[PDB]
């Protein structure tokens, strides 16, 4: 039983709704069944732009900063990209080289890099 409750008082953040696309994009993965993949592959995935898009805690006239377009989709740039990286913190993927535009490893059950990255 116990009460729950979940939250006090934050509607969602692009940090917030973000954590959650990055579970859309692990989700993604199993459903497409891959083991490697990129951001912008899933920016087209509506089911995903869907969260990627979805409304936060913004109030401003846009970003419009090293962005070639105009319809919003940038700031899901923002929530996509991220995406991606807390997957690499949960350990759902991860890049071996870095780059932001680089190709996302999934973990999909399977073998991955080893976190001992050894630098001398």
Known sequence: GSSGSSGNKDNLDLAGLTSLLSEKIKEFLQEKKMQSFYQQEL?????????????????????????????????????????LQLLQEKGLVFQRDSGSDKLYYVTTKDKDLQSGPSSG
């Open 43 to 83: 920016e087209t995935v509506e089911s995903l732009q869907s969260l990627a898009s979805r409304p936060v805690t913004h109030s401003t006239g846009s970003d419009q900063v090293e962005l070639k377009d105009s319809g919003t989709s940038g700031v899901a740039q923002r929530v996509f990209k991220n995406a």
